[PDB]
Write a protein that binds this ligand. Structure first.
Ligand code: MG
Ligand code: MG
Ligand code: MG
Ligand code: MG
Ligand code: MG
Ligand code: MG
Ligand code: MG
Ligand code: MG
Ligand code: MG
Ligand code: MG
Ligand code: MG
Ligand code: MG
Ligand code: MG
Ligand code: MG
Ligand code: MG
Ligand code: MG
Ligand code: MG
Ligand code: MG
Ligand code: MG
Ligand code: MG
Ligand code: MG
Ligand code: MG
Ligand code: MG
Ligand code: MG
Ligand code: MG
Ligand code: MG
Ligand code: MG
Ligand code: MG
Ligand code: MG
Ligand code: MG
Ligand code: MG
Ligand code: MG
Ligand code: ZN
Lengths: 55, 71
RNA sequence: ACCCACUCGGCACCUUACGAGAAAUCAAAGUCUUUGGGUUCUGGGGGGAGUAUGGUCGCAAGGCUGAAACUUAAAGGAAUUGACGGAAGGGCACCACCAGGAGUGGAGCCUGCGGCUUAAUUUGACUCAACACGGGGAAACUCACCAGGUCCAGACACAAUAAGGAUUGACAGAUUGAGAGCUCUUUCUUGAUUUUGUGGGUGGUGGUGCAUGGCCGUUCUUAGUUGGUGGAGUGAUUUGUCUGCUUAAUUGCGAUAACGAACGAGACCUUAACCUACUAAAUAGUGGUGCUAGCAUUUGCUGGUUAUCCACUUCUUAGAGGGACUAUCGGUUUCAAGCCGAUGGAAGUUUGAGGCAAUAACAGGUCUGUGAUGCCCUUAGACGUUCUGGGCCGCACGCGCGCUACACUGACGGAGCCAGCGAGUCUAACCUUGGCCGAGAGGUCUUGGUAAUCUUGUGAAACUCCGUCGUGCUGGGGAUAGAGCAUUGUAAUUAUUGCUCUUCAACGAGGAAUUCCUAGUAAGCGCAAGUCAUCAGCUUGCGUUGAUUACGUCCCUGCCCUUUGUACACACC
């Protein structure tokens, strides 16, 4: 948003540029196209040679 | 830049005159009153408005330009 | 003579930094506030000045020694980052060439800028990045220009004129372009609303774009900018940000005192390509079924059909999704990023086209878009506003974008007859079918449509096709001009525009130069929209026909990057 402010000498241009948090976006895309999330795997306990449960 | 040319002839506006307007009613002694210069016949005019007398001319001024009636 | 090793004394060189230093750099310029080996010489802000004077040397030019008055806040050293260079070295690009295309420049006319002219020819802009730009196609308007005529729309406060009237208007005539009571003749009207004055406002397409906001153009068809911690430097700073390689790209690969991130790029967004799959549609259609016309008569072919119903979604339309990742493979290369061909595929040039766009530069443009604005100008004999009329179009010429032409791949007459992006009427007079009258322009009576519903399938134009001409400034070309009919509008003369007939110029391919452009592109062709009462030779889009030639390069041109140099830093204006 931009505003002419009027002083004795003249006019000053006001230009404000505000960046609201993408994560909070609510009703619209909630991060940048730049944003690449990876989901973190789990640790694995190997072997446990074949055994079968019975219900 | 450029400025100020005249043929002369600088004018001036309406005069309006003054006098003292209303002496025209003729009041006889004890006590009655006659009215000089008969008034106007239009319905927007209230019988207090007269007709100016020039030549061929008795004309109404309360209705702005309206209805010269010659007598 | 050569070699190898040692050693003195030499001309140098490399690497280092315990040290030094303002730094560049120094094996001395190191052993210095932890200050002392011996000794000679010089200097104590810049200038005045190596000047004056005296002494002395010389043949002379000159050498030596050598002040001060006065003046002045810096001069100055090394290094740093920028800026610039008429320094190199790499690059990048059809606003650059290569190869070619189509031209422009030559001609006619159309328009813009200049000059000239003029009562006025209002004005902004001058290389790219001014000249069909100001949306700038002006008959009034617009208008700012010129010749003239009214108006206050001078808020408000103070003071005065003044209810014995402060002030307003005016019929007819004079007057005026004017049926302007402008002003005057004359004499009614009018009633505290104004008038005169000072102060103060206001209005202005008056000035200043070199006072500013805003917006915009260019650098930029660019690839550039920044910070964490870590390395260097006393420091400003630097490295990260780089030899090479690679991309359109600071895009990456890689190399590596850097590692890992941020903006810009990319991602993103829009539109264009693909959905016999999903959800649907009498404002979209296809099929079937009725109703029906013509021809063949064997059923068939081709149409008409207010919904007459059945059924559907391939066309279409727009919701929802899927698809491409340069995938597969084969080449090549630091077998790295990539690049290359085939295959597959709707699509493989960033899939094509845009939109968006970092910091930084300009005294770039715009007070003539604004009730954005500072200052100055003016403010009532107005630069305000309006009314009347002319002018921006004025024509010995110079320059720019273009339009139409020189024809036979053509003009002309018939004829076949194919789009998309569009837009449209309520306080109306728009998009308009159809029918009637008109050679044409056009008029008139109806009609639907606020529109996927009516205009429209916008039956556009190049074009295809059968002919008339036959290469002759020709039947190519249509300037110029005359006469006649219509149309927009209060108004058309200097002829808004259109038609009809007659007139039939230049131009026989255009000199030096010079622009745009690499694929559904170029170029040819028309349409729709902007503007608009009328007026497109212009623009913004769109489809129709559809190539030749590159797949490269740094030679001209331009610009980016490092290296370099600097006495610039208000930065080569
Ligand atoms: Mg030495
Ligand atoms: Mg000395
Ligand atoms: Mg001194
Ligand atoms: Mg000396
Ligand atoms: Mg000296
Ligand atoms: Mg000397
Ligand atoms: Mg001497
Ligand atoms: Mg001697
Ligand atoms: Mg002597
Ligand atoms: Mg060429
Ligand atoms: Mg142009
Ligand atoms: Mg224009
Ligand atoms: Mg005018
Ligand atoms: Mg004016
Ligand atoms: Mg400027
Ligand atoms: Mg200037
Ligand atoms: Mg640091
Ligand atoms: Mg750092
Ligand atoms: Mg740096
Ligand atoms: Mg980004
Ligand atoms: Mg793109
Ligand atoms: Mg006028
Ligand atoms: Mg003009
Ligand atoms: Mg269509
Ligand atoms: Mg249609
Ligand atoms: Mg002809
Ligand atoms: Mg050129
Ligand atoms: Mg129209
Ligand atoms: Mg219209
Ligand atoms: Mg015109
Ligand atoms: Mg300086
Ligand atoms: Mg100079
Ligand atoms: Zn009357």
């Amino acid at each position: 948003a931009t505003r002419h402010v009027l002083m004795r000498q003249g006019v000053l241009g006001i230009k404000v540029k505000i960046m609201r948090d993408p994560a909070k976006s609510r009703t619209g895309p909630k991060a940048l196209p730049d944003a690449v999330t990876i989901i973190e795997p789990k640790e694995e306990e190997p072997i446990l040679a074949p055994s079968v449960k019975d219900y | 830049k450029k400025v100020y040319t005249t043929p002369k002839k600088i004018k001036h506006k309406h005069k309006k005159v003054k006098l003292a307007v209303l002496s025209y009613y003729k009041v006889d002694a004890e006590g009655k009153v006659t009215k000089l210069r008969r008034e106007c016949s239009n319905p927007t005019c209230g019988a207090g408005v007269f007709l100016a007398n020039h030549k061929d001319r008795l004309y109404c001024g309360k209705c702005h330009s309206v209805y010269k009636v010659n007598a």
